[PDB]
Amino acid sequence: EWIPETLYNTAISAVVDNYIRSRRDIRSLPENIQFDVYYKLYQQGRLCQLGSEFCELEVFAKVLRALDKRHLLHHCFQALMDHGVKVASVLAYSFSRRCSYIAESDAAVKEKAIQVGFVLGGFLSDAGWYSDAEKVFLSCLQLCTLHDEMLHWFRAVECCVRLLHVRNGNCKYHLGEETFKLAQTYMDKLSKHGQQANKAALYGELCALLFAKSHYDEAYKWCIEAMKEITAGLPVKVVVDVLRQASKACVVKREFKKAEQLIKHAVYLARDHFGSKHPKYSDTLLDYGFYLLNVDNICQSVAIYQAALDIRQSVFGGKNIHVATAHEDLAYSSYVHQYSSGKFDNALFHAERAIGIITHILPEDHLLLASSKRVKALILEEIAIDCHNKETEQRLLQEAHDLHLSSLQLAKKAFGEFNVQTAKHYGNLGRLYQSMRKFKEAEEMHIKAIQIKEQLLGQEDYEVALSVGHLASLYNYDMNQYENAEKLYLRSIAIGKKLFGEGYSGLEYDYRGLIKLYNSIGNYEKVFEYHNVLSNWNRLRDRQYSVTDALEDVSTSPQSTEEVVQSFLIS
């Protein structure tokens, strides 16, 4: 009803229109005043004047102290990175340049640099620019290892916990192990000098590094180690980061009961302190949706990723690596949700964006492309099957064939031959070669995918069961040796009902495989039985599938911070 503009807001537009003359004296304004001047420049679209002062570390130091309006700084920072000027790169270089100049100076001036380094390095870590956050953290780590004092090793351990976080997201896993070993040097030295440093966040970072390298046995071992040292006095951001990456290790360990009590509390705790539109909250949903993706909670797994992406999109601007990873999970979630329907319209668009965002900001040989290009290739595979024109099919399958091996090579270089992810690509290639009519190559790929993934995971695993199903689906159609698939299919249903029950999505293509196997040899005493199994399958999962999201499922949590920790630890 035409409320007059506040004199605070009215005076903001009064100095923005006269920015050029008063440009020098705006930097003398208070921090609460100073931020609103810059946020108005972005709102007016004057990004060039906005970027004319964020390139200085000192100006960006005052702006970083507006903690309430940090969600607006992230949206402005991403706008500059799409505007042109590499404000992330120049700030990191400028901080690293000035950091080395106070090595011989006193610790009073020095301690200010680490405080500046952590807020700036934490912000770039939040903003996703891991390649520039690493150079910030490596500079402040250097200061902490110059003068031997009890406080210096107390923050040197605080650099290595965040150094190991900016190298987990940047796919520098090879250098991640060295940082942990370097962390133990100051951590043990502090422990000897009457200060047992908290090994909770630092042990929590290995819950993602070893998880990324598919060291599930080692990650779950460090999952238990990280969860023990939690404390109610820890920061909530530190606490929620442990729960997310501890829950992920439980999902791949084929344990579902203790995982959901961990990650749901992680969702609840993140939503409480931060809110429903915070980057840390969205980081929990992607880890939370990873649980829903593997427990056959497929209906809300797409929604929880869709909710997760919208949080990052509202805060992280345009071409940001965090949006691409949010795009990545939603692209794959729609891939498995639209499998029967074939509606991979938004699935490819999210996948196309996932390629689009990463290639602009990351190097062409970065490992995150290998994860990103794999899902888009899976989109191209199912699209060519659904398309009617055979000329379209022969081109798109080759395009998907281009992405898998390019993705596989990056996985091979960074993970080694004997790893799940390399064997994960082998399973994809076997299914791909079935569509590519290279059946003999498909047989070679499937046996590679099942003699390596099963070798280290064990005889009982979710992904191993799917890899059997890929080769079981082979012998049914192209090889036509149904005796081989008779034992293979029987393994697929066997592992399917151990954890997922009868009503699992992959088991539908498994029960149908037995009937198709039995239909060739004229067997009918089991076809009639297994037709009743499909009728049981068609109802029982759909009996308990009614629409229900996950944000109200967690709701308020009766479980407290300690009620979740001890329950998971003792069991």
């Binding site: 498995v336 899902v375 199912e382 994960k424 890929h470 293509y509």
Partner: peptide, 6 residues
């Protein structure tokens, strides 16, 4: 059925 988990 659909594919391996990512």
């Amino acid at each position: 059925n659909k594919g391996p988990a990512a």
